[PDB]
Write a protein that binds this ligand. Structure first.
Ligand SMILES: O=c1ccn([C@@H]2O[C@H](COP(=O)(O)OP(=O)(O)O[C@H]3O[C@H](CO)[C@@H](O)[C@H](O)[C@H]3O)[C@@H](O)[C@H]2O)c(=O)[nH]1
Ligand SMILES: [Mn+2]
Length: 342
């Protein structure tokens, strides 16, 4: 199947860094056509994209008019424009170009050497397991000291939609387009009304990194969190690996058994690196206050979207802490997310 890479651009000429890496690693022009959809009408950015010639297909969002926002959103016009562009660009990919799937990449993302290999290998999983609705290149807790550099091949399922370099099927666009929101499209997909309990595949080591400090949003989130996610640099031949462990029936039995079979250790002991003979442990949280407390104590992202923690799966957040595998998890009686955990 032909899987286009849809690059979303606007007014940053640094889309050059994004395209340079994509084109450098692309293993096949036929299998991975690059379509750059540009919003905004920024001339310099338009010239940069055009300079790539036939290496890419340059399409332009047609409606550059200002958008009438709701009363609570005067400061958020940019988020409305992003949502409009996504609807148009994805519509072009699935309706005009009629591709079966697409990998969405924002102009300020740099891809890893094995970005294409990763999606080539996981497309079949997504196509075969309806409990999955995406494959993302992003590990929300992917800071260098929180990932195992000796396991660049390790993948997980996550209930938290990461975006930032993600694959979706035309089947999903058919589902989302009729109800596409006016703004904040990513947080909208994180709601249960959209997710419907489905997961995404995400890696131990992120296959994308962001360099867009200046953007639509102010920079605190990027400055304190996003900019620290480490880009994988060790090529993993995913298409040669057995990724059957990611199928829901295998994962929910094996990964959960692993998590709850692991010894529980007090957060303070993990933090101070006590009991090092325990290479893999579980730090149990029982409420919203213990979760945020323990998350912050261990350096994990502590915000929640519709009650789901970053990179969480059945409430479990998995990461590395001072060389130890840690599973920040709820009691095994867990049975659903609570959106009131804010
Ligand atoms: O008028 C605009 C402005 C931006 N963009 C594009 O939107 C994307 C995100 O813009 P950016 O300035 O980088 O903002 P972020 O703060 O990074 O936006 C966050 O929130 C967005 C949804 O509101 C998500 O799409 C992003 O992935 C998420 O990082 C990029 O591909 C831009 O080219 C447009 O299409 N039109
Ligand atoms: Mn950005």
């Amino acid at each position: 199947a032909v899987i286009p890479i849809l690059v979303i651009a606007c007014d940053r000429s640094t889309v050059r860094r994004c395209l340079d890496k994509l084109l450098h690693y692309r293993p096949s022009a036929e299998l991975f056509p690059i379509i750059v959809s540009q919003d905004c009408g920024h001339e310099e950015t338009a010239q940069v994209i055009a300079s790539y010639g036939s290496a890419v297909t340059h399409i332009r969002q047609p409606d550059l008019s200002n958008i009438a926002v709701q009363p609570d959103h005067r400061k958020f016009q940019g988020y409305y424009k992003i949502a409009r562009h996504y609807r148009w660009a994805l519509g072009q990919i699935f309706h005009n170009f009629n591709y079966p799937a697409a990998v969405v990449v924002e102009d300020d993302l740099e891809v890893a050497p094995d970005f294409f290999e990763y999606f080539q290998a996981t497309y079949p999983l997504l196509k075969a397991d309806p409990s999955l609705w995406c494959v993302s290149a992003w590990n929300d807790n992917g800071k260098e000291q929180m990932v195992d550099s000796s396991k660049p091949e390790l993948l997980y399922r996550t209930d938290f939609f990461p975006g930032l370099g993600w694959l979706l099927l035309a089947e999903l666009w058919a589902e989302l387009e009729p109800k596409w929101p006016k703004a904040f499209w990513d947080d909208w997909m994180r709601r249960p009304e959209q997710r419907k309990g489905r997961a995404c595949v995400r890696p131990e080591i992120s296959r994308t990194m962001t360099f867009g400090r200046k953007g639509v949003s102010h920079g605190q989130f990027f400055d304190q969190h996003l900019k620290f996610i480490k880009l994988n640099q060790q090529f993993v031949p995913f298409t040669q690996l057995d990724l059957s462990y990611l199928q829901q029936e295998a994962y929910d039995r094996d990964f959960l058994a692993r998590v709850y079979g692991a010894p529980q250790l007090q957060v303070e002991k993990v933090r101070t690196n006590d009991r090092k003979e325990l290479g893999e442990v579980r730090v149990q949280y029982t409420g919203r206050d213990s979760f945020k407390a323990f998350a912050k104590a261990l350096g994990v992202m502590d915000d929640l979207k519709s009650g789901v923690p970053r990179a969480g799966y059945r409430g479990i957040v998995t990461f590395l802490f001072r060389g130890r595998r840690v599973h920040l998890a709820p009691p095994q009686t867990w049975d659903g997310y609570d959106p009131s955990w804010t």
